Amino acid sequence: NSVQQQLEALEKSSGGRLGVALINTADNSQILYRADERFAMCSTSKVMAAAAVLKQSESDKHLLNQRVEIKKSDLVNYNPIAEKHVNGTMTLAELGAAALQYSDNTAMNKLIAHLGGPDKVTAFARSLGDETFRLDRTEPTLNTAIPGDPRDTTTPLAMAQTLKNLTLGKALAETQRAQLVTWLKGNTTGSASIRAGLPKSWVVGDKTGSGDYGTTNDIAVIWPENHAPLVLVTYFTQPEQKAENRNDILAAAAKIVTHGF
Numbered sequence: 384n385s386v387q388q389q390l391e392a393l394e395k396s397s398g399g400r401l402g403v404a405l406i407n408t409a410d411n412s413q414i415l416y417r418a419d420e421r422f423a424m425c426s427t428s429k430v431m432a433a434a435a436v437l438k439q440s441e442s443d444k445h446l447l448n449q450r451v452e453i454k455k456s457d458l459v460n461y462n463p464i465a466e467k468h469v470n471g472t473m474t475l476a477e478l479g480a481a482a483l484q485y486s487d488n489t490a491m492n493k494l495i496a497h498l499g500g501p502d503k504v505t506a507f508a509r510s511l512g513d514e515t516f517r518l519d520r521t522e523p524t525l526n527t528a529i530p531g532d533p534r535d536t537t538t539p540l541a542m543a544q545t546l547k548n549l550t551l552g553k554a555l556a557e558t559q560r561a562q563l564v565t566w567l568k569g570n571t572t573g574s575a576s577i578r579a580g581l582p583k584s585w586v587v588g589d590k591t592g593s594g595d596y597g598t599t600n601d602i603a604v605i606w607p608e609n610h611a612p613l614v615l616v617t618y619f620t621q622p623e624q625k626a627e628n629r630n631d632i633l634a635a636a637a638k639i640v641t642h643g644f
């Protein structure tokens with residue numbers, strides 16, 4: 384079976400809708416499966432918010448160390464890092480780290496608020512040539528992931544292209560690019576997702592996302608030991624609101640598309 388046939392079969396068994404975009408930076412070849420279809424990003428959108436702040440920091444050398452007050456009222460449904468800092472402050476850098484490496488929702492909301500709202504995150508994506516990404520809501524409602532709802536969505540290909548630009552390419556100045564990569568490499572939430580489908584010693588940076596409709600996502604930059612990087616987006620969503628999330632599908636898709644590298 385071809386890679387396409389394997390992906391189609393995986394989707395068939397899965398009980399959902401699978402979206403994959405792999406970019407092989409050796410030759411810009413791509414493996415695409417529903418790669419132009421929209422999916423709710425869920426926490427994969429945290430990358431765009433953090434990157435928007437990194438972009439601002441290129442022209443404001445004091446920005447990343449700017450204190451942000453964390454109040455009890457700021458806490459939302461998931462605040463593993465921010466809850467430790469209630470009544471204190473976190474810097475914008477610390478909020479970027481928490482949003483990316485722990486998927487902290489308070490951190491995401493502080494980034495969005497700092498930027499001036501979801502529409503400003505969209506404008507940042509557009510400035511990178513991403514015509515597809517849209518952020519519409521804050522946490523936690525941006526994760527409703529209702530089938531057919533365009534809010535807080537992108538496509539696998541758009542997000543793969545933008546993640547490539549952000550981490551390996553032209554989007555950010557070097558220090559900021561390196562910081563984003565450091566953050567992604569230190570992610571703590573992705574063990575069972577794309578990473579689980581790859582050779583154990585490959586270096587990976589990723590951001591997971593999950594939401595309602597069993598929406599289960601991961602976006603990754605992958606550095607093989609003897610090959611150019613790969614950029615991989617695996618998005619997955621299901622028809623029923625209370626579907627279980629399925630990181631195993633993402634691992635399986637990653638294994639299918641990285642065979643041979």
Ligand SMILES: *[B]([O])([O])C1=[C]C2=C([C]=[C][C]=[C]2)S1
Pocket residue numbers: 425426427460461486488523526591592593594
């Ligand atoms: B993200 O990782 O997709 C997240 C979304 C929510 C989290 C916690 C609570 C509610 C939504 S993490």
